Structure 1
Amino acid sequence: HHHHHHMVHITLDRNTANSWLIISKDRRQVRMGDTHQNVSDNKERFSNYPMVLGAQRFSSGKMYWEVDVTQKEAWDLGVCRDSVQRKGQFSLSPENGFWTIWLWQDSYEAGTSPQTTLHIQVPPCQIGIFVDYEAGVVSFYNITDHGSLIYTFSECVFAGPLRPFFNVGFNYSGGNAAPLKLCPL
């Protein structure tokens, strides 16, 4: 790929965070806390999962950013509609307004309904996410493996503004405490 030059500076929106998340002062890192983080509830917060949105909203153009997933056992990454459901249980699918991939139990999968098996030879430590709003494309790149393609969603129905989407995953095992980090340009 040669998408790096559509690089955008993403920051995390604390107001949208699950109440157990800890977002760094620079709003570029997020991790699962070991308790409720002493914030009030609001209608924007994801209630059931350790999810948070980026502050940026996109309705046009080409956008690219990178995320560090080093030493995590579980996470979800991608984009979603600004209007996605925040409360209760739901599945990550384009029908529900999500364009995502994940790591879970030593397998990588794309968030289609049902999920799609990914084929990655080099486990990634950093993921690139590319959105072409006009083309209806969301693509994922393996930065650890020379930028090799992981997955492309095409013919996307964004149906409104998009926000960067993150899930740090649960830490039931004690092996998934590490943060998601937005990588410098």
Structure 2
Amino acid sequence: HHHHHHMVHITLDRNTANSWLIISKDRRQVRMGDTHQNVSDNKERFSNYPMVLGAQRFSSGKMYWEVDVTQKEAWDLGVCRDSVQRKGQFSLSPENGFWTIWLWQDSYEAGTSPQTTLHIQVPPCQIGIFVDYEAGVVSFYNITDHGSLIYTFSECVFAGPLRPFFNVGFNYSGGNAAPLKLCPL
């Protein structure tokens, strides 16, 4: 892909984070803590899952960023509407305002409804995410495999400002503590 030139500097919004997440001082890394992280509750926080939004809101243009997923067993990545539900149980789907992919139990799937099997020969250590607001496109790239395409959502109906979306996943297994990291430009 030739999307690198639309690179944007993403930072995490502490106020949206699940109360168990630990966001680095530079707001570029997030991981699951082993307990509640001693923050007050607010209507922005994802309550049920280890999720957080980027601070940046996008309503036009072309945007690109990269995320490091090294050694994780489970995660969700992509973009979502600024108005997505924060409290209770929900599925990741375009109908709910999410355009995401994930790793879970040694398989990769796109967050369609129902979910779509992805075909990845080289397990990615870094993921590229490209958003074309006007075209209604969200694309995912395997940086580890020379930028190969993973998945394209097309004909997207964003229906509002978009925010970068992250889920570090649970760590029931003891093998998923590693952070998500926003990679340098």
TM-score scaled to structure 2, two decimals?
1.00
State the Cα distance separating 1:58 from its structure 2 match: 0.1
User: Is 2:6 the partner of 1:3?
Assistant: no
CA positional deviation for 1:147: 0.1
Q: Distance in 2 between matches of 1:29 and 1:65?
A: 14
Q: Which runs of 4+ in 1 moved over 4 A?
A: none
Aligned CA RMSD, in angstroms, stands at 0.1
CA deviations 1:54-79 (Å, max 9, x no partner) are: 00000000000000000000000000
Q: Deviations over 1:23-75 (max 9, x none)?
A: 00000000000000000000000000000000000000000000000000000
Partner of 1:140: 140
Q: 1:58 aligned to 2:58? A: yes
Question: SS of the counterpart of 2:96?
Answer: coil
Structure 2 portions without partners, runs of 5+: none
Unaligned runs of 5+ in 1: none
1:84-140 per-position Cα deviation (integer Å, ceiling 9, x unaligned): 000000000000000000000000000000000000010000000000000000000
Partner secondary structure for residue 91 of structure 1: coil
Deviation at 1:173?
A: 0.5
Distance 1:21 1:172 in 2: 15
SS in 2 for 1:95: helix
Q: Does 2:133 match 1:157?
A: no
Paired with 2:10 and 2:129, the residues of 1 have a C-alpha distance of 11
For 1:96 and 1:160, the matched residues in 2 are separated by 12
For the residues of structure 2 that align with 1:158 and 1:24, how far apart are their CA atoms? 29
How many angstroms apart in 2 are the aligned matches of 1:33 and 1:83?
26
- % identical equivalent positions: 100
Q: Which residue of 2 aligns with 1:72?
A: 72
- 1:134-170 deviation per Cα after TM superposition (whole angstroms, max 9, x unaligned): 0000000000000000000000000000000000000
Q: Quote the Cα distance in structure 1 between the aligned partners of 2:28 and 2:159.
A: 27
Q: CA deviation at 1:10?
A: 0.1
Q: Quick one: distance in 1 between partners of 2:183 and 2:3?
A: 15
Once the two structures are TM-superposed, the CA of residue 15 in structure 1 deviates from its matched residue by 0.1
Deviation of 1:178 after TM superposition, in Å, equals 0.1
- Tell me, in whole angstroms, the C-alpha distance in 1 between the residues paired with 2:141 and 2:51: 21
TM-score (norm 1): 1.00
CA distance in 2 between counterparts of 1:163 and 1:65 reads 12
1:7: Cα distance to partner?
A: 0.1
